[PDB]
Amino acid sequence: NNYTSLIHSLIEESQNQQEKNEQELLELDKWASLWNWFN
């Protein structure tokens, strides 16, 4: 019934994946913007 500990682990996993996906998206934007500074 350890479900409570595991469910909380899933919650954290869900947040680690969103935060990295978003991080990486803003990496792209910085680069694309520096890139468009020349184009």
Next chain:
Amino acid sequence: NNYTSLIHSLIEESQNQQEKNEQELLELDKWASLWNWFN
């Protein structure tokens, strides 16, 4: 620039999504807590 709003449209959609998945995980946390408090 339009890569920027596109990046943001994907950052927003990734937020809403992550929040829905967290809500369905919270609802599972409710049922495991109910399971527990009974028995």
